[PDB]
Coordinates of C-alpha atoms in Angstrom, one line a residue:
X1 CA 4.0 68.3 -237.9
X2 CA 7.6 67.6 -240.2
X3 CA 10.0 65.5 -237.7
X4 CA 14.4 65.8 -237.7
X5 CA 16.1 62.6 -239.2
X6 CA 15.0 59.9 -237.1
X7 CA 13.9 56.7 -237.1
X8 CA 10.9 54.7 -235.9
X9 CA 10.9 50.5 -236.6
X10 CA 7.7 49.1 -235.2
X11 CA 7.4 44.8 -235.3
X12 CA 4.1 43.2 -234.9
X13 CA 4.8 39.2 -233.7
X14 CA 3.1 35.6 -232.1
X15 CA 5.6 34.9 -229.8
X16 CA -4.0 32.9 -226.9
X17 CA -7.9 31.6 -228.2
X18 CA -9.9 33.9 -230.0
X19 CA -10.3 37.2 -227.7
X20 CA -7.7 36.3 -226.1
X21 CA -5.1 36.2 -229.1
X22 CA -2.5 38.8 -228.9
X23 CA 0.5 40.4 -230.5
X24 CA 3.6 41.8 -229.9
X25 CA 4.0 45.5 -231.0
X26 CA 7.4 46.6 -230.3
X27 CA 8.2 50.1 -231.0
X28 CA 12.7 51.7 -231.4
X29 CA 12.3 55.1 -231.9
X30 CA 14.0 58.2 -231.1
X31 CA 11.5 60.1 -231.5
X32 CA 11.6 62.1 -228.0
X33 CA 6.6 62.2 -228.9
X34 CA 7.5 58.8 -227.3
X35 CA 7.8 58.2 -223.7
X36 CA 10.0 55.3 -224.2
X37 CA 12.5 54.4 -227.0
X38 CA 12.4 50.6 -227.0
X39 CA 9.2 49.0 -225.7
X40 CA 6.3 46.0 -225.3
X41 CA 3.0 45.5 -225.6
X42 CA 1.0 43.0 -226.1
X43 CA -2.2 43.9 -228.1
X44 CA -5.7 42.5 -229.3
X45 CA -7.0 42.7 -232.5
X46 CA -9.7 45.2 -230.6
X47 CA -7.3 47.7 -230.0
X48 CA -6.6 48.1 -233.0
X49 CA -9.9 48.5 -234.0
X50 CA -10.1 50.7 -231.1
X51 CA -7.4 53.3 -232.4
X52 CA -8.5 53.3 -235.8
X53 CA -11.8 55.0 -233.9
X54 CA -10.3 57.1 -232.2
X55 CA -8.3 58.6 -234.8
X56 CA -11.1 59.2 -236.9
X57 CA -12.7 60.7 -233.7
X58 CA -10.0 63.5 -233.0
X59 CA -8.1 63.4 -236.3
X60 CA -8.1 64.4 -239.8
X61 CA -5.7 61.3 -240.5
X62 CA -7.3 59.1 -242.9
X63 CA -6.5 55.8 -241.4
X64 CA -5.3 52.3 -243.5
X65 CA -6.7 48.9 -243.9
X66 CA -7.4 46.6 -240.9
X67 CA -6.7 43.4 -242.0
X68 CA -10.1 41.5 -240.7
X69 CA -10.7 39.4 -237.9
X70 CA -9.9 35.8 -237.6
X71 CA -13.2 34.6 -236.0
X72 CA -1.6 31.1 -244.2
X73 CA -4.2 33.0 -242.4
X74 CA -2.1 33.8 -239.2
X75 CA 0.6 35.8 -241.1
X76 CA -0.9 37.7 -243.9
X77 CA -2.5 38.9 -241.2
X78 CA 0.2 39.7 -239.0
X79 CA 1.7 41.7 -241.9
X80 CA -0.8 43.7 -242.2
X81 CA -1.1 44.9 -239.0
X82 CA 1.7 46.2 -239.2
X83 CA 1.6 47.8 -242.5
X84 CA -1.3 49.4 -240.8
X85 CA 0.5 50.3 -237.7
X86 CA 3.7 51.6 -239.5
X87 CA 1.6 54.8 -241.5
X88 CA -0.4 55.5 -239.0
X89 CA 2.7 55.5 -236.5
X90 CA 4.5 57.7 -238.8
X91 CA 1.4 60.4 -239.7
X92 CA 2.2 63.4 -237.9
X93 CA -1.3 64.0 -237.1
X94 CA -1.1 60.1 -235.3
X95 CA 1.8 60.6 -233.6
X96 CA 0.4 63.8 -231.7
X97 CA -2.7 62.0 -230.4
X98 CA -2.7 60.6 -227.3
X99 CA -4.7 57.5 -228.3
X100 CA -1.6 56.4 -230.7
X101 CA 0.7 56.4 -227.8
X102 CA -1.7 54.5 -225.3
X103 CA -1.5 52.1 -227.9
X104 CA 1.3 52.0 -229.2
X105 CA 3.4 51.8 -224.9
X106 CA 0.9 52.2 -222.3
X107 CA 2.4 56.0 -221.4

Protein backbone atom coordinates (compact mmCIF):
# COMPACT_ATOMS: atom_id res chain seq x y z
CA UNK A 1 0.00 0.00 0.00
CA UNK A 2 0.93 3.65 -0.67
CA UNK A 3 -1.58 6.09 0.85
CA UNK A 4 -2.69 9.53 -0.43
CA UNK A 5 -2.01 12.86 1.33
CA UNK A 6 -3.60 11.94 4.68
CA UNK A 7 -3.34 12.33 8.40
CA UNK A 8 -3.45 9.92 11.34
CA UNK A 9 -3.00 11.12 14.90
CA UNK A 10 -3.24 8.68 17.80
CA UNK A 11 -2.99 9.79 21.39
CA UNK A 12 -2.51 7.70 24.49
CA UNK A 13 -3.59 9.28 27.80
CA UNK A 14 -4.64 8.23 31.35
CA UNK A 15 -7.86 10.00 32.48
CA UNK A 16 -7.85 1.41 37.20
CA UNK A 17 -5.64 -0.73 39.52
CA UNK A 18 -3.31 -3.48 38.18
CA UNK A 19 -5.01 -5.46 35.43
CA UNK A 20 -7.83 -2.92 35.40
CA UNK A 21 -5.46 -0.08 34.52
CA UNK A 22 -6.56 1.31 31.18
CA UNK A 23 -5.38 3.92 28.70
CA UNK A 24 -7.61 6.17 26.63
CA UNK A 25 -6.72 5.92 22.96
CA UNK A 26 -7.91 8.74 20.70
CA UNK A 27 -7.73 8.55 16.90
CA UNK A 28 -8.23 11.41 14.46
CA UNK A 29 -7.94 10.54 10.85
CA UNK A 30 -9.20 11.10 7.33
CA UNK A 31 -8.08 7.65 6.13
CA UNK A 32 -11.07 5.84 4.58
CA UNK A 33 -9.98 2.38 5.87
CA UNK A 34 -11.12 3.50 9.38
CA UNK A 35 -14.86 3.23 10.13
CA UNK A 36 -14.65 6.41 12.31
CA UNK A 37 -12.74 9.62 11.73
CA UNK A 38 -12.68 10.43 15.43
CA UNK A 39 -12.81 7.81 18.16
CA UNK A 40 -12.00 7.01 21.72
CA UNK A 41 -11.42 3.60 23.22
CA UNK A 42 -10.20 2.29 26.51
CA UNK A 43 -7.45 -0.32 26.32
CA UNK A 44 -5.28 -2.25 28.70
CA UNK A 45 -1.68 -3.07 28.44
CA UNK A 46 -2.61 -6.59 27.60
CA UNK A 47 -4.59 -5.47 24.54
CA UNK A 48 -1.27 -4.16 23.20
CA UNK A 49 0.31 -7.52 23.80
CA UNK A 50 -2.70 -9.09 22.02
CA UNK A 51 -2.37 -6.78 19.09
CA UNK A 52 1.30 -7.60 18.70
CA UNK A 53 0.57 -11.31 18.66
CA UNK A 54 -2.28 -11.06 16.17
CA UNK A 55 -0.03 -9.07 13.90
CA UNK A 56 2.79 -11.62 14.11
CA UNK A 57 0.30 -14.34 13.33
CA UNK A 58 -1.46 -12.74 10.38
CA UNK A 59 0.98 -10.28 8.85
CA UNK A 60 4.59 -9.67 7.99
CA UNK A 61 4.72 -6.51 10.14
CA UNK A 62 7.75 -6.28 12.44
CA UNK A 63 6.19 -4.95 15.60
CA UNK A 64 8.02 -2.27 17.57
CA UNK A 65 8.88 -2.85 21.26
CA UNK A 66 6.43 -2.45 24.09
CA UNK A 67 7.68 -0.59 27.19
CA UNK A 68 7.02 -3.21 29.89
CA UNK A 69 4.04 -4.00 32.10
CA UNK A 70 3.63 -2.26 35.46
CA UNK A 71 3.57 -5.25 37.88
CA UNK A 72 7.94 8.78 36.43
CA UNK A 73 6.84 5.13 35.98
CA UNK A 74 3.43 5.69 34.33
CA UNK A 75 4.42 8.60 32.01
CA UNK A 76 7.39 6.74 30.44
CA UNK A 77 4.98 3.84 29.87
CA UNK A 78 2.35 6.05 28.20
CA UNK A 79 4.95 7.55 25.87
CA UNK A 80 6.12 4.03 24.96
CA UNK A 81 2.63 2.87 24.23
CA UNK A 82 2.04 5.96 22.08
CA UNK A 83 5.19 5.43 19.91
CA UNK A 84 4.27 1.81 19.53
CA UNK A 85 0.71 2.35 18.33
CA UNK A 86 1.67 5.20 15.98
CA UNK A 87 4.39 3.12 14.22
CA UNK A 88 2.14 0.12 13.88
CA UNK A 89 -0.91 2.06 12.71
CA UNK A 90 1.33 3.95 10.30
CA UNK A 91 2.31 0.72 8.64
CA UNK A 92 0.17 0.07 5.56
CA UNK A 93 0.39 -3.71 6.18
CA UNK A 94 -0.98 -3.22 9.72
CA UNK A 95 -3.73 -0.91 8.41
CA UNK A 96 -5.07 -3.78 6.41
CA UNK A 97 -5.68 -5.98 9.48
CA UNK A 98 -8.97 -6.51 11.30
CA UNK A 99 -7.01 -6.76 14.61
CA UNK A 100 -5.69 -3.18 14.36
CA UNK A 101 -9.18 -1.81 13.75
CA UNK A 102 -10.70 -3.77 16.57
CA UNK A 103 -7.96 -2.45 18.79
CA UNK A 104 -8.25 1.16 17.74
CA UNK A 105 -11.99 1.61 17.25
CA UNK A 106 -14.24 -1.29 18.25
CA UNK A 107 -14.97 -1.65 14.44
